[PDB]
Amino acid sequence: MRVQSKGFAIFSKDEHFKPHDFSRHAVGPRDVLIDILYAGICHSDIHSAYSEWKEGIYPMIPGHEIAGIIKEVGKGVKKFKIGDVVGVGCFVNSCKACKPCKEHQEQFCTKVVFTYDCLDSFHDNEPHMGGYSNNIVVDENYVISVDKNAPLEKVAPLLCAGITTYSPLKFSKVTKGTKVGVAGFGGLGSMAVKYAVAMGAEVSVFARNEHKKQDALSMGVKHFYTDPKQCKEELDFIISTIPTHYDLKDYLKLLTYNGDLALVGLPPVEVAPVLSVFDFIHLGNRKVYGSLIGGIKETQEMVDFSIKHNIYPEIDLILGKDIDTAYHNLTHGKAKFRYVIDMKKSFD
């Protein structure tokens, strides 16, 4: 039997979100049915909702920062029981037979099923629906285990903001004394800041004004800039989470010899920056790479780490009916860090 669901859907790129009844695939012998308690809003939600990257699949239900409780399990499930506290991230399935799947980087699988705005090739190519909803059905190998005493409203954005920034920090070996820049001081940015500080880094933040400078300082940030040109120092590592137009050269030039610039931010495609061969050679010996989310394994490692060291996103709790207001704030320079939807209260 298909699982009945409800959530907050957008029907085309210029409309408002509305309550939407729908259904998901039946609980298969390896699936679990999760009741969703908290749903983080990521800026990827907005880019997808508005078709800023590509043409979206509508009706769309975004949200891929999911924290909840296991209500039901398929009969072959071994990794979870009813009552378990869990999280779901940016994808819910992959082919499990390719090189990326075998290397625990399922996010690069060519048959990866992202949580929303993506056809589910494992269920007759039906559109997958995200986390702005009351439940979700996920193959057990894509579910993150969460400590039952962790604050669940704070856990939810670890599922995307947390892994996406944790991953390149570890990949570039950020450690004690590493000079780290964080460009874009929002949901991902503040997680990058917290992890780099917990890792022993000396952290610089680049924002567009000083509205959150005190929160930066309170996080242990050593330099706060409102323009990359103000930074007079060479950095070893920079993570750019910027979701609007900018010039990659302004950051690449800040790096020391053999420094890394890790790109996670994803502006709309028509304004997204590029680097040419001439740019790399002019600013030579400074390395650039991209990072996409993380694998299931490293996502589990990151959640475990974050709960252990009490490293959580700064969140503001809202209801499903506030989604349009949250998206406005996030696109007009009015947001703080993460918004999180209290899904139980939204569905009274």
Added chain:
Amino acid sequence: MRVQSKGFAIFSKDEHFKPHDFSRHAVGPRDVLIDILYAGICHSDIHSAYSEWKEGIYPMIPGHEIAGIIKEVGKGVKKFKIGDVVGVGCFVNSCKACKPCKEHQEQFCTKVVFTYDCLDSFHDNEPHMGGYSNNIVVDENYVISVDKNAPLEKVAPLLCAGITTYSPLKFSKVTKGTKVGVAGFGGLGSMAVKYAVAMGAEVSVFARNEHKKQDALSMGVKHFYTDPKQCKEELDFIISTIPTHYDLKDYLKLLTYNGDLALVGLPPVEVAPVLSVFDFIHLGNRKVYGSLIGGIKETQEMVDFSIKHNIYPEIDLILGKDIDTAYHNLTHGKAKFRYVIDMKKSF
């Protein structure tokens, strides 16, 4: 007293080379006068000659692969004597006072003087003339010491093709068992192969056809492709020397996790490939950087290493009057590896 010279000049971006008489600044107290014996031809000479990157300064005398013999020294010269065999690469002066200068990366000095197609601010902003000529006057700190018995025609291209490929291989710590790809099998491509092979790497070459497949095999190349999509394994390190349009993503996607793509090739600016943020993220965990020539100190080390291990470019000797044919061959797929001008025989 200005030094008198002659060589082979282009007078605008769409013309043929012509014999040209000209003069150079006098031998200053830290300068040496060098008699040019062999002048390597670099594709950078063509891009500059043809204004493919920016507005050229004409008349222009390219060549930044110079081997020769010191004929005079200024009175304050302390590293060189008359008779020393030496090389000159892509630049002839710098501020000496910035941080790149001090860290032996003079090629990044904002006041660097490139060997040609560049105004020399140390000499009243006059255009500097390169190596397609009988002589050159260079500050001694920009001159490379060359073993007096090394084969000078094969030394000349070390001064640019050598350092440019040697530097990123060292920077990326290519070593025994590293899987290395080299894209564009021409002057820099062949040097890069020979270094990587000498360093014990497993080497793949990427060309546009198989005309030089047997030569790759001769040099110890393990795999030869005519399309990057042919390559079915992951590479630790790729150096791209390509001077025409291509899609960077075809190479980036061949790198293993934590692999390096090193960019040195510089196609005309109007068709220079780019990577967007979307490209990097879709192809995550694979690092890209550019490399520019090398500093003097690393250039000296590269030359010492090459000479000591007998690692030399494959060269074909030509006359100065054959410059246009050589440029033709290099822009029409008919070149082998490096052309070198036999300067003593060119006048």
